[PDB]
Amino acid sequence: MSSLPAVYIVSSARTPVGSFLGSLSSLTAPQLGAHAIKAALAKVDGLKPSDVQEVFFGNVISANVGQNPARQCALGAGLEESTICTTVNKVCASGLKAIILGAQTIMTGNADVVVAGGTESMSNAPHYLPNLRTGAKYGHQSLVDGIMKDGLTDAGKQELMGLQAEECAQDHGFSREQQDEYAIRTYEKAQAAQKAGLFDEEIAPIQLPGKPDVTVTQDEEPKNLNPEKLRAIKPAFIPGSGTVTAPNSSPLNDGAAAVVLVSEAKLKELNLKPVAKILGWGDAAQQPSKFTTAPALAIPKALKHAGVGQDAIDAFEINEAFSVVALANMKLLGIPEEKVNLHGGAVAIGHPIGASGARILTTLLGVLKAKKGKLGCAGICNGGGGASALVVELL
């Protein structure tokens, strides 16, 4: 990695994360992505939107979004029609893999300024009618929920991710109580960070056309913590013996996040101030129903690519697809919770799946700054068996 051109993050931005059919549900995925891209570029003193040459944007449930979600994001943000745009789907890791591809495109010399990230509007995922072209002559038919089909169901086992979370709890020995206490802790961290203003800088508030105008400034989920109801609710995927609940799982959510990447030569030519340096990354994958612990492969790989030891990381973002996912990866890797998701995670903040990989990187940069850290690592598992991870240095 060191033998390649350096890639600098000169800014990042995210929308608030809205709840399913909640505060951001009137916005399409490209409207959220354009908003995040525009807000990221506005932060870079000396860089113009017309300087952006290429965009990689994550998006998982693209049905009915229209041609090339990333291109709509880029044009809706005011980028030039000359901008190269590609939409990326690695399910929940789409937003981080997009950033990786953007970094590589600078490294091979095909761009000097790249915007990358991801968006998802799970609120506006449609239902599918799959057999209208050839017909179904007789019998009841089905309308497929696109979130379930293209977001949350393992293709091979045809089981929702919550059932894979239960495999994780069984495979690595985490009870209902341990998952519940993890979830309460991450809600508490997200609420503390909210109240102390620590998300103010990364979040770009959304102004909804008005009745008068509404401004959405906060992530919607963190305030929902009720620890009594959380400990009392019935398990959501396995009656009786189940351990995974809707409170201790990530929700369905809407949101977007973006980073701006520049080459070393371009940094100097425009006299830009870098926020961070990308040191390395890693993708890994294993058995699809075991996607939950693929970050225990991707994270060591990213660290080795970056040439950084694990003990040197100041903060990790381990995406909280479920509380059990953080618990199992912390156990497998030997990472203390004291270094993980310092401002809370997706169980408390939300999980707009095509965007989460870029969302946690944005939050990591804030964590490193708030905590006077220098080296951070983001790792995110994805449906299908994969994970992606990235190592940054805050400058």
Add this chain to the structure above:
Amino acid sequence: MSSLPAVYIVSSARTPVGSFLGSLSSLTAPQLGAHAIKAALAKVDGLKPSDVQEVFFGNVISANVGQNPARQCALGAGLEESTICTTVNKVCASGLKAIILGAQTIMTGNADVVVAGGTESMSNAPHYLPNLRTGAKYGHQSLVDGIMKDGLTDAGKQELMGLQAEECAQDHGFSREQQDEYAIRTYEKAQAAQKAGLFDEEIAPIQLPGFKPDVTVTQDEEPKNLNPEKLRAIKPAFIPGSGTVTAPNSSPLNDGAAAVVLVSEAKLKELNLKPVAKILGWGDAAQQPSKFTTAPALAIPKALKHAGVGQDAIDAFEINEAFSVVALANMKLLGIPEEKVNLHGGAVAIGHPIGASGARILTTLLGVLKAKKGKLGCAGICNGGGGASALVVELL
């Protein structure tokens, strides 16, 4: 790009291209992509499917395909669960951008063996019901055709790509007759290539098991449909009366997949592999969305410049025939004679499974260079939204 590590193509393969609701309509997009991947890998003497580390696969209309189409393609082809899989959507250019990203992943050292390509099952693209979650209290409601919405309609103007093809004929002065005569010529080239067996190597025939006798699908479905009299007499498809773009002189809707196998120099030597071709460079470009038709006139010089190759040195071009007018306009703007273009026919005659065509034309290009004893080839493909991608290869 010379200072960049070398990327070798050690094999490629494609499915036959089936017609809309036609010979391959019973197969999903990942079944088509798995078929192409598995056939491509089976050609490489000394390389195993378990050696593949990373997959990039194009796919545009992914609705109802399930989690990560590219991952389903990889697993369905027998690749290891350890394989890194990413689905890519640059509309009609998806299958070529996927190959570009695969090459880059070798070049930055993160893989030594990459499969890349694309797949589309336009037959199995569903319809959408967009307002069931919140409800619609009263009134007739729409069922959205996913092909039109996510494949064929420019997002900005809400207009079908055929309409922007008319804009191309008006802008660049191509009559109905010029487009029809181009279409007939590319059908004849594709039929001649079919008849002479020149697609035999690149196509992996598909066996459909009987649920009833089995069916083997061996050839592209569309080329045989040429009827020159009906083609010249048919009505315009998008502008009544004065229209010039028709269904016969446009690409159809189709099902198919294509894949290439990429390796680093080190791996080529380690396994003593025989390379088919070397990737010399690539280029993406974009312009105004409704002018996507002539974005290849930007991407092709860019790819040539990245490759350090002059346009005159190319032996064969693939300019993807999204419409007949698209090949004509780009040949005119670049000054490329038609005798160097789509020598075995193009997408108007062969078919256009949009997520696969970028990889499909590269596969066909490699067969064209071999049959015509060429050395340098260039593939370029426009995409809805204003984009294009292009790639230069050297036959070894």
Add this chain to the structure above:
Amino acid sequence: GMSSLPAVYIVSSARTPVGSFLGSLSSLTAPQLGAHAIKAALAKVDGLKPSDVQEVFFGNVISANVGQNPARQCALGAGLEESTICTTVNKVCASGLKAIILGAQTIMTGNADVVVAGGTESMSNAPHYLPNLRTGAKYGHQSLVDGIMKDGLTDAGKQELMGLQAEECAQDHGFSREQQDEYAIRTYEKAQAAQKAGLFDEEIAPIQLPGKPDVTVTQDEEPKNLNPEKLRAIKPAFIPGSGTVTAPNSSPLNDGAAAVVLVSEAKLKELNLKPVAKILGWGDAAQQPSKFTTAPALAIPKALKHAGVGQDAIDAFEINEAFSVVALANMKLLGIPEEKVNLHGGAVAIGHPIGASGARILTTLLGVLKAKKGKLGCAGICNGGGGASALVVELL
């Protein structure tokens, strides 16, 4: 004449409250509403058992997804014997009154002695249709058909909504937006005055909704929505600018049911029953489908002739208010003063559950004749398609 045929007596009537579209009763199906009204009407007859009911006619218009034979479900849901004959009747808006006519006739031919008749409609639960899933639709956006619009509110011939034909009525007979608005206010006041005084309490059978205590719908939902400021200010519903028909001066979409018990003169004396009323005659009429609004001006005199009764002898009229202009026009053509029409309000204020309204207005008519100490009543109701039905009762 009617005198050469057996006499038919009304011994009981009952109706549910009339719910608003997706409103208070939207959780109940049309057979549940109908079973409720049947059960209530039978509970009122001292000396009669539900097992004595031999045949049921029940109106229902939008029967999609209600299941096999809605009238049979209303009858078995009400606790009638499984030997009971059950037929569902669709004369659109007139179904509820034609089912009563058909029941009366079944006694008069001597095929039954105890008949329950009426109608039901859950417009809240009218589904959307997907019309072409069996054969398929290969390419293009498709439609989900609102069953209320298709099977309830749209004239089949000209494919125009009945509201636009109410506008035709207004232009035909000279009634302004102001005139229609003022009538609507007046019928809303008559409705609210009736509610205030308890004059609907007898006819209405309140509905209990399980869930620990039970919620109870006692009143019609629409009358309280009156707002004269908003009513006179709202924009027209079918013709921007020059239109006179508005949603406030039209009938709403509604849920509800109503039923009457009929007995032959033999059974009335055989188990010594108190008769509420006698059926003296009826009339069906029809004309140009787009002129259905004035079809009661034909059906009403035909029913009066059949009864051997003069229009001046009638003490109270119920002219169903499909739209305000329907009541106005029919009063104009017939020469009937408003002081004898819809004395407790009409469908504009009360609701129009279309399969039930024919029986609903007859139920309210009996209450008006009681409250205002009348003897002769006439109910007339128009239906989409050009028709109307009318019935003449004598309070006993």
Add this chain to the structure above:
Amino acid sequence: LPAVYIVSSARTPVGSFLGSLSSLTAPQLGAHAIKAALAKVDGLKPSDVQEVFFGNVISANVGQNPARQCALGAGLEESTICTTVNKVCASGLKAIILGAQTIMTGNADVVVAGGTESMSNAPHYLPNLRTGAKYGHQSLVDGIMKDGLTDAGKQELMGLQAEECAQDHGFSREQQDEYAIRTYEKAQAAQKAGLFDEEIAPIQLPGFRGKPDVTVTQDEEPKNLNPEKLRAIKPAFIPGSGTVTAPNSSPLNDGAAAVVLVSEAKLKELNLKPVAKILGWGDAAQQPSKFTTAPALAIPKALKHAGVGQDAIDAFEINEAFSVVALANMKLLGIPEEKVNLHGGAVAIGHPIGASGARILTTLLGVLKAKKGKLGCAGICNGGGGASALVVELL
């Protein structure tokens, strides 16, 4: 009470499901049968018809008042009273009873009654679009299964009620299969010998985009019999031990039929020639799942009301909802098959449910003409537990 005379009758060919008549709507078939019936009565003009009762079961998406569209399509006056009736499979016969009753109370002099069904064009239903469904796959209800073929209380298809009838009365897969073959050959014989030619009004489907015009003259189903395939195909509603199959059950079909009825006075006033006189009728019902044998109540009730003994009837038309049903009701009433469905039955002819009650009356008049009988009786069972029976004297 006044006498009621049938002056003519007509029926469309019975088309197969998605078959020869699938391009026609239920009111188009119904209009076609009314117009053909009224063309047969010289001395009666179409404008003399005052009232229509027309059966139709699956009315979804047919439009306002199917019977009204039938009447207007046929050329009847806008002044005509039109009512659609639904007693499921018995709708087309209950309509005729209602028409007779309307003449008997002196409210009409000329009535048209019958039924129509287009099961090819029955839609699917989306029942929850108005209130919505936030998350989860949803159902498109097949309108034929819901409003036509499923008992409401038991929620089971009519094929399962057929198996009940088999176990209740002792008929095996072989007995039902031999009856199906018997009635199939009775249908083929009549086609070959022209015994349906009078009752059927052929339909003209003109193609004018260059395609050739098509005339449908035959019933589509009777030619499909293959006894080798019949005896050997698997059961339809109970695997392994079932007795009911598609070849020995009635199919889903398209078709319509109509009769013209006149009062005693109108027959004399216009000098009309009566085909038959309606002598009596009966409706009966019992347990909904035991609807198969409700004809065993309606047939005697109709005979009693007409003042005619069972031994005097020359031909019965007992609608073959299933082969078992004809066999069972013959065993209950003690009727020999040699005087039943002499031109075939619905198992071989087809069963457009809203029309069959008039379809079998039409075919009954053609049997009495050909067997030179005078007393004929038709009975039809319907979903929900009901049945209707009519008795006519040919003149």
